Design a protein around this ligand. Sequence first.
Ligand SMILES: Cc1ncc(COP(=O)(O)O)c(C=O)c1O
Ligand SMILES: Cc1ncc(COP(=O)(O)O)c(C=O)c1O
Lengths: 392, 394
Amino acid sequence: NMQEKGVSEKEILEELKKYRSLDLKYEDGNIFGSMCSNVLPITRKIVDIFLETNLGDPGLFKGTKLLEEKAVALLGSLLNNKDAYGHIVSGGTEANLMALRCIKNIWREKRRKGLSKNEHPKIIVPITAHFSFEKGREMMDLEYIYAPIKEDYTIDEKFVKDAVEDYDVDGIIGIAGTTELGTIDNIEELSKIAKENNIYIHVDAAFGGLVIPFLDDKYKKKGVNYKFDFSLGVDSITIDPHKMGHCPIPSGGILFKDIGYKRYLDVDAPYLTETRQATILGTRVGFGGACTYAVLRYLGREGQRKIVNECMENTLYLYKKLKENNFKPVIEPILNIVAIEDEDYKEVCKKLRDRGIYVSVCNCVKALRIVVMPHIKREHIDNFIEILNSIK
Amino acid sequence: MRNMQEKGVSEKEILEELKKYRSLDLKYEDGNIFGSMCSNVLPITRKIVDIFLETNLGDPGLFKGTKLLEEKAVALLGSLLNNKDAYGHIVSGGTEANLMALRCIKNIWREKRRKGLSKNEHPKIIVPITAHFSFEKGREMMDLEYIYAPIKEDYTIDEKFVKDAVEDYDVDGIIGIAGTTELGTIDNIEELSKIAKENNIYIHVDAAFGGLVIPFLDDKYKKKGVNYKFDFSLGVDSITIDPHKMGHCPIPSGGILFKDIGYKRYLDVDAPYLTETRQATILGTRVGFGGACTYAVLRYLGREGQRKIVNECMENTLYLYKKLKENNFKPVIEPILNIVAIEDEDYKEVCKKLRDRGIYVSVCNCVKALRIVVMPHIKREHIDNFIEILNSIK
Ligand SMILES: Cc1ncc(COP(=O)(O)O)c(C=O)c1O
Ligand SMILES: Cc1ncc(COP(=O)(O)O)c(C=O)c1O
């Protein structure tokens, strides 16, 4: 209940610290199933400096707005597109929803011209797609043609080519670093199908966008597709600094091939400095853009390769330890994600929590899921294997 | 720079560049910003942001204390809005809050539709023309059919039209506003909630701004005949209320409260890899500091402190109002909340001339007027200065 008298700052900070003490901390080696991790320390200073900014009213914060544009230009450069148009948004979910909005509005235009026979947009989506796509389908009344995956947990490209032939398709979704397994769809083939048929293609690189471009050849595998960016001519790409960009939440990213896409996103915001708004959110943080730009500049490709390399070393060490202890990884890892087959995977995940280890689970395969973020070290992997052995 | 490079750059260098950029921004405390519903955060919140920065309410089983603080923030807001059983979240802002209420309305309709109980192909929702643009984003993305309710001379929803519409159509939802975006006016939620209750229609109240002002408004500032009742005491289904507006909390700190936990089934989406496998929010990964700040600010201030902040904003609102009248300007209405609008046929150009002079005001949508939000950063000194620049422009 709301009381009449206020409590002192010291009293309330102490209570909040008591609650904080009940949370897990990334640095302690308990969190194995998260795509978030410890932020680069420089970002704490940046959050403080840009806390009182709002990119929903960018006319009042011209420097912070410039910084958002520069964070987006740096991501564009990274994704081989010097003319990318985008935003540093709340996360991969808003980013995906905005790509879905764009697909829907291109369709709506065709429909209102008598140039589409679809009553709802038909979009091809793999079953490995993140649940943000389910949120979009449910809200926006989108019609999904679910694409099956192959033995290697990548989208069946033959199925997509056949679907495009049999139906009037309004969009194709490809994933560059799946939530469950870190696999990469064959975006090169998907984009060929998309270009030849004039279909919008969105790439969900929320996770892999800040891993794949910095992945050393040593970790790349024969037969795996690593091409996923604007050099393939794709229309949009989701990419999240608050995942493998070590930036504070909220720092998501959405990039469109060019500024002409804005036309399918803008809504009127009459009382604001920018009367045209393309984001789903209105009032939104300015520190995400400042942090994304800062971190990419501070690290350079060199610093990010170093962090990805260490994550990959620890991923390979985890994989190696699993094989030695008679566990069955789902696949040899592509990115810094390993999944462990288990017929009783949901209960095993529960038993691991009780022992202080918090792993995730897969949805399309009966397996435990581990994301080897920078906070995971060999000592933690050793402790996890000894606890898992003890449980089995 | 604009392109990636191989080598990193020092912390000193990048912080120096960032500060050059920050210096181009306006600052709330400088008396430049007159049209924002955001202001300076209470200093205590900077410490809370830092403590809770590395949390994520999208994976609450990893951050059990942070989740408990979200629940306590929602409970404190529920109590303030006369509901000790409220179910809700500290979300990204009033937009996501409003979008969640619209999803709830749509999912109740969908349930009816499949049960052969609705004749509507899309949900029909009564929306006043003073509704915030988040409502348009909703309409556009979710294929919602809006029955646009007109406003009366006092800029409040025409309750008769609403009752007339509810009679003529199969209505799925009604939207009322407690502190309109443009003028700070309050719809007659009592009448709307009576119409809603008697017809078993979902009613959502957008109190994004007014939710943290109205409950702390001293009688001295209330006007006879004006409706101030807007909360769960009226039996409404959901209320949007934003701490990052008049709660002095850092962005993102928005709020969505539902009458009870029974509303959650109309929002849940499966999140199979996460500690909590059902998410009701639109966002997935999301700040944990919003709830911590919301709860802490409400405890730190108490009703006493928030009442003092709100009342000084009203003192400054009445001062601005007097100064306008004394200088022959025409306020659109007598202020209800801490928002004053100035009638001007040439509002678009005068707004531009004001920012050329360093004053940044807003404009209205349904009336030709400049729009001023008297947030706590606006003091008499700034109001005085604004009147001189505006008289000088004329
Ligand atoms: C591939 C992919 N897309 C989208 C998302 C959603 O991102 P966020 O949780 O930041 O909203 C995630 C992670 O949850 C992801 O794995
Ligand atoms: C009445 C009302 N509802 C909703 C919103 C949206 O809030 P936000 O910008 O925090 O998304 C606003 C803010 O402008 C508002 O004034």
